[PDB]
């Protein structure tokens, strides 16, 4: 399907295998759509983490598992100025 163009909201607190559990709710009406996922550094530049969820999609108006990069990162759910950016701090490596 086409990519989700609208924004998302956190259903609950982000849960912390080292990975994080993100529970989202879609705010748009263009479903079925694929959830855009990306990770950024403390400056907002592309800084690759790792999306665990094989194919995160919105069936109707979704649990996202991902391993954040070590240190400071921004977990981006969606595209553009609308996009939900989760500033995350991962301690270590040990």
């Amino acid at each position: 399907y086409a990519m989700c163009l609208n924004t998302f909201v956190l259903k609950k607190e982000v849960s912390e295998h080292g990975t994080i559990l993100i529970k989202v709710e879609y705010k748009g009406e263009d479903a079925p759509c694929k959830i855009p996922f990306s990770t950024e550094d403390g400056q907002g530049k592309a800084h690759n983490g790792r999306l665990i969820t094989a194919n995160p999609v919105v069936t109707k108006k979704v649990n996202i598992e991902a391993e954040p990069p070590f240190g400071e990162s921004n977990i981006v759910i969606g595209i553009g100025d609308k996009a939900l950016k989760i500033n995350w701090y991962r301690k270590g490596p040990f």
Partner: single-chain antibody, 228 residues
Framework: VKLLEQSGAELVKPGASVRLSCTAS????????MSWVKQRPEQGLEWIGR????????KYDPKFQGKATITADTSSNTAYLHLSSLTSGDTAVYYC?????????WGQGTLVTVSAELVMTQTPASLAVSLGQRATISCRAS??????????MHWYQQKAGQPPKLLIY???NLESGIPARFSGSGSRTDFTLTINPVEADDVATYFC?????????FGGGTKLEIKR
């Protein structure tokens, strides 16, 4: 579709107890938090507390400790509000509300008639604005309202005899179906709601609300009226 069905009006004696229900349909009650909000006649919104039905965790505003109790039934997809030793001060409309990043879904409310920490500074208390002009409502928090670098500040519109409606969530995001004339902005402790241009439909009471950490405190409210 997605609906929050509340139980009928209650006429209770002073000193007695009452249980109100909030039946959730079109969604799993465990997916997000469930809050209860108190509104005394002609007064502001008062966040009672919230429940996480997946683990049964409850959090309350200290003002409702020893008065209110919140439970959830995950087999019937229902949330409950328990009120103890009722007084005239408990006479109010009680709303159940779903969510964290702004309450998009509210119940119709339940009237309860009893027979005979962060500070949210919302300004102005009353606002008279001419048609086609700009109306700005301010909300000042005593502490930080940020979580994951996002300001957990939400705005609500409340018209006569109606439950509140979500306008803005996460300080600046417009809720689906809300016109472009409504806008929100803010960072740190200062937040604003702008209605430009103002029309006759905008005559309502407006409320700001934080949700990053408990209590999920509402502002005192802004009654918006039309002048010449």
């Amino acid at each position: 579709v997605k609906l929050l069905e509340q139980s009928g009006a209650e006429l209770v004696k002073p000193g007695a107890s009452v249980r109100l229900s909030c039946t959730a349909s079109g969604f799993n009650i465990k997916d997000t938090y469930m809050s209860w909000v108190k509104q005394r006649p002609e007064q502001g919104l008062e966040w009672i507390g919230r429940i996480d039905p997946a683990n049964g965790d409850t959090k309350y505003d200290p003002k409702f400790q020893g008065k209110a109790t919140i439970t959830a039934d995950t087999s019937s997809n229902t949330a409950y509000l328990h009120l103890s030793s009722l007084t005239s001060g408990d006479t109010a409309v009680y709303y159940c509300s779903r969510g964290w990043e702004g309450f998009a879904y509210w119940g119709q409310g339940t009237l309860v008639t009893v027979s005979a920490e962060l500070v949210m500074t919302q300004t102005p208390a009353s606002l008279a604005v001419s048609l086609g002009q700009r109306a700005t409502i301010s909300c000042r928090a005593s502490e930080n309202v940020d979580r994951y670098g996002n300001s957990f500040m939400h705005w609500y519109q409340q018209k006569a005899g109606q439950p509140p409606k979500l306008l803005i969530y996460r300080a600046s995001n417009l809720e689906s179906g809300i016109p472009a004339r409504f806008s929100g902005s803010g960072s740190r402790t200062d937040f604003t709601l702008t209605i430009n241009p103002v029309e006759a439909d905008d005559v309502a009471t407006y409320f700001c609300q934080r949700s990053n950490e408990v209590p999920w405190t509402f502002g005192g409210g802004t009654k918006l009226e039309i002048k010449r």
